[PDB]
Predict the structure.
Amino acid sequence: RSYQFWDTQPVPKLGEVVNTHGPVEPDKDNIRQEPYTLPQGFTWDALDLGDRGVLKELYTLLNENYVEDDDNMFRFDYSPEFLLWALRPPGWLPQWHCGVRVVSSRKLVGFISAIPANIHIYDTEKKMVEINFLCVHKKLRSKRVAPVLIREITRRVHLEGIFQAVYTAGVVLPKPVGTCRYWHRSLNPRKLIEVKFSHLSRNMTMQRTMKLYRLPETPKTAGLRPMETKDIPVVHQLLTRYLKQFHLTPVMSQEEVEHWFYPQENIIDTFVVENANGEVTDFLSFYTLPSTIMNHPTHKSLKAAYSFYNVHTQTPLLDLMSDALVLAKMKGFDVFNALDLMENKTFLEKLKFGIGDGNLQYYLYNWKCPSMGAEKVGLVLQ
Ligand SMILES: CCCCCCCCCCCCCC(=O)SCCNC(=O)CCNC(=O)[C@H](O)C(C)(C)COP(=O)(O)OP(=O)(O)OC[C@H]1O[C@@H](n2cnc3c(N)ncnc32)[C@H](O)[C@@H]1OP(=O)(O)O
Ligand SMILES: Cc1nn(C)c(C)c1CCOc1c(-c2ccc3c(c2)c(CN(C)C)nn3C)ccc(F)c1F
Ligand SMILES: [Mg+2]
């Protein structure tokens, strides 16, 4: 298999055996000042997401044209407020919210984003960007517009002095640094079956299925409570120390910890364990991301919670995640999703997750290093 675009890029070849560590190519000391050329009739536009009208335009583009499941039954439905959380963390830049519009109608038809992040990869720490929300309108697919988006965001990142990036995708490209499977924990099995997200087992009745997945009405862990402002420093401390055991991780500042974890309703939830001495010893977090259910007369939307970062030092991880499930059910979610990264394999089967169909691939741009098992991956992108 050959890759017309990716073979030109500074990433290793599929099937390459990698035993070194470092950049694929040297930093560039002169950078192209002009935007790359788009097909006739289209134009670049940097989106001011602080403008409510423009934010709505981006919401609509993704709602109608972003990621679907392998069976074209479900599509991500990121909320406007969620998009602000994901796209304006500390250090964000407006030129890195890179849109494509139709010149005559002004209709938004393409997008790609970068946000800054410090990344720890094996024995090196590097200022990088995270690339996300690449999207091309359904009517423009298969016209080689995506390589233009990728080159242009690459150019604009270069201008700010950054020459490495990290990203994830479902498709196989040159060349994965890690491969994760996603798993799903049923919370509202009757609905999941009716919309064909999952199927009734041939050796189980619906009645048995509902009882199999029933949860406690309240969490077990003593001292569990929502994260507060006073917890920001200790949460930062807990996260930084916990992440050292993995090989691909973010390195967050205290301000970045506040952004990514301080609770925002219908976006991000974080709960800490404050013990008998008043000490915070653990925390769990998950983000809110529904999926549109397409072509269905009665059910319109699937409510899903996604496991984020979970740190344990005194409470068992199994107990922590059990409480996470209970909280999601209480808050009205239909399903709780988790990847098989970090230590997650220790609890997925015990807590009745079922394996999904598909991979999430992890990638680095312009950095050569050996691949790693999923258990060594310690980074999560929205
Ligand atoms: C130093 C700074 C560096 C910064 C940049 C770092 C790299 C960033 C990389 C981006 C990370 C994004 C992370 C996320 O956001 S992952 C989410 C991706 N988005 C979606 O799945 C939304 C639904 N799909 C679409 O909107 C379109 O199908 C997209 C836009 C995905 C492709 O549009 P289209 O289907 O009309 O195709 P084309 O004819 O224009 O172009 C075909 C070429 O594009 C390659 N392709 C297809 N999908 C992806 C993909 N997800 N990553 C990388 N490459 C991809 C493909 O192999 C082929 O190249 P080659 O096979 O000929 O070689
Ligand atoms: C539910 C649902 N609705 N839709 C429309 C889909 C695909 C799903 C499966 C979601 O799968 C995941 C993903 C996960 C899997 C694949 C992904 C993604 C997330 C993302 C979003 N970020 C990570 C780029 N892009 N891609 C291709 C990440 C973590 C999980 F726990 C999952 F279960
Ligand atoms: Mg295209």
Q: What stands out?
A: The two ends are 30 Å apart (CA to CA). The helical segments are 52-65, 80-87, 146-158, 189-194, 206-212, 232-243, 254-261, 317-330.
